[model samples]
Target: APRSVDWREKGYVTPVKNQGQCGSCWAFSATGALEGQMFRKTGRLISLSEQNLVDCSGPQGNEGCNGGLMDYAFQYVQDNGGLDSEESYPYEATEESCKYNPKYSVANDAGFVDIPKQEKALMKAVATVGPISVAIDAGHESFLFYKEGIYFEPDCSSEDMDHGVLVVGYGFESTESDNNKYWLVKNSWGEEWGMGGYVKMAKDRRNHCGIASAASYPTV
Candidate 1:
């Protein structure tokens, strides 16, 4: 594998989005992963419908804007034939009745695979499998105001995951004393948050923030 990999640079990842006041991070995470798979197959990037999952995946245990898991969302998409585009089922950041339009569905998926609970496996998956969906412990106040720098909250736990995100790439920043190796992540809190709706988390920290504990990716 290459020393560094950024799925966004290759045009596999879509633009950053905002989850708003809703706890729909899982929906966004699922869409991002599926979007990557779609782009890989069709050579075109299509923004997917997070709202579709939010409203439709309730039977799969997705609580719409309340909360959900990326893996479950993928299952719902597969069972539902496919997922619609952002334009057809645009997000309102809140829960609503399912209004999925089959004609507007742009992406389909067979299923998803959970990455092994190891940093090495997760890194390899991100390097070769496009942006991998991951859930992390994002409960600290510092996490909300993170603007730049490789974020490393030592107090953060690897078991108390509360948010979903995308591992877009991985690289190291060389400094005089040591290297600041980090994983570049894409968040759905809009471009105004973090580093343009993105964050660099300290990598190789024994699955810090449960990043690899629930990591997974879509399959064509």
Candidate 2:
């Protein structure tokens, strides 16, 4: 754990389970941020349904389980009376029936306050914002070949591909090299994926939030 922030000090930091094998990264990432925002806004960490965002959110630049922008998704929810928890609606990740309540699907547009810096954005986001969205190369060798922490990366150029994710907060970790690493994120791959599915990106690395979509969301 590196660059850790005690979100509870300011608000609730939620744990999101990533929609594995599905291209619903957009839905998952957006929902994660909304969950945090709703928690902060109402003091409740309600699990959300990416399935809802998948079917609804009307052409917000994503289809099915594929990856897409989360910032748009955030606004999509806010304008739509907000998304619901998985408990209330459930997420299939796959294409399915729109079992969503129309009351929660009304679309509107809201503005955001950009922090001007990633580190400040992350810090301000985690300390202030809720579930945040980022992108990374999911098709990476280390990721594709991961069986355990035991990664089997193939010889491929470090392509700048992107996938969406949620940033819960920052933390620190000590290595046998007698040094510590300032990890930059948390993931929605449950709490049992790679480094708990939390990624360790370089600190203050601007716009490196998964590919080039260095974005996150706040529900309020």
Candidate 3:
């Protein structure tokens, strides 16, 4: 049986971020997982710069101001020595030239782990690791207006993932009609989007929205 876990309650989850209109959800998602791992290891929650990935990670096949993958971003961090803090390399919400300075780096990663493409493996990874990066189908308009409650998109797809997010925790919730097991996901749409910039997506629903199709975490 799976045990309930909450990184927010454990105090490693950082504040929610806003990606604006840029297609840089990948950067934010990777940063969120890195921040959580760094926090768990050092007992200090430092905000890493997504802009660093947005700008400097292009060589790893990441498109600045466009889109990228968490694996590429993680490799960029490892190859580039480390990632800078958000304060030192603030986000501009648009494409910009690479201005990364090694002196500003505040965190680094040894490597990353790609969890098996299964809901059970994802749950175990989240329980053991602090947080994990995941991709999903955020193409639905309903997902944009999501406010509260356990989200279960009937049309959510697993083949094509267009958006990335972070899974910080997992637990079970009991409602009047059902018992819900969900993944506590952190989004980059700001705090006003859903449950304070977070969403509890239906877990074990055949890898709903491709959340389990592409999941990974950094080893700090």
Candidate 4:
């Protein structure tokens, strides 16, 4: 059995961020995990720059603001020394020229690791590591209308992951209909969305929406 943990209540999770209409959820996803790890290690809550990655990480096989992968972003940080703060390289939410400043870099990652494609393994990683970057199929129409409650996208498929998000914690919630275990996932869709840009996704459902398919975290 798995015990519950809430990183948000402990202040390890950062504020909800907005990615706008850009397909840059991957950048936000990577930043969310790294931010949690950095806070846990240094007791400092510093926001890293996603724009730095959007512009400078092209060589890492990332397609700038269009799309990217968390692993490649981690490699880009490791190879480039480190990443800058939001103040150093602000986010424009659009494809822009690379203007990375090594001098402003405030943090770096030694490496990153992928969790096994299992809910139990993913939960263990979330408990031991600070936070985990995860990708899900956000193409479902229900995701947009989501407001509250344990979200279970029955129509969602794990075959193709199209959106990136962060899993900060997990716990059990007893609804009127049923008691459920869920992952406290953080989104980059701003603070106006589900539970202030967060979603309690149904867990223990055999890797719903590929949430456990591509789970990973960074080493600070």
Which one wins on TM-score? 1
**lDDT per residue as tens, model 2, 68-167:** 5676676666666556567777766577655678554322225343333345655666655654566665665566333332222333223364577666
Residue range 42-144, candidate 4, lDDT tens digits? 9998899888888888898899778999988888889899899987788888888888788998888998999999989998898888789999988887898
Ranking by TM-score: 1, 3, 4, 2
Model 2 worst lDDT run, 10 consecutive residues: 148-157
> Which is the better candidate, 1 or 2, if ranked by TM-score?
1
Q: After superposition, how far is residue 64 of candidate 2 from its true place, in Å?
A: 2.3
lDDT of candidate 2 vs native?
0.57
Better lDDT candidate (3, 4): 3
| Clashes per model (N, Cα, C within 3 A) | 0, 21, 0, 0
Per-candidate Cα RMSD to the true structure, in Å, reads 1.1, 4.5, 1.2, 1.2
- The C-alpha local distance difference test score for the whole of candidate 4 amounts to 0.88
Residue-wise C-alpha lDDT for candidate 1, range 1-220, written one tens digit per residue: 6778898889998889999999999999999999998999999899999999999999888998789999889999898998999987888988999999889989988889999999899989988889999999999999999998888888889988999999989998875536477889999999999989999998887777889889998888
Q: Which wins on lDDT, candidate 1 or candidate 2?
A: 1
Give the Cα error of residue 192 in candidate 3, in Å. Answer: 0.6
lDDT of 3 by residue, 1-220 (tens): 4578888898887899999999999999999999998998899999999999999999988997779999899989998998999999999899888988989999999889999999999988888888899999989988998997788888999889999999998888886648488889999999999999999988888888999999998878
Tell me the deviation in Å of residue 101 in model 1: 0.9
TM-score of each: 0.97, 0.74, 0.97, 0.96
What's the distance in Å from true for residue 166, model 4?
0.4
Candidate 3: deviation at residue 96, Å? Answer: 0.9
Query: Which regions of candidate 1 fall more than 4 Å away from where they truly are?
Result: 175-179
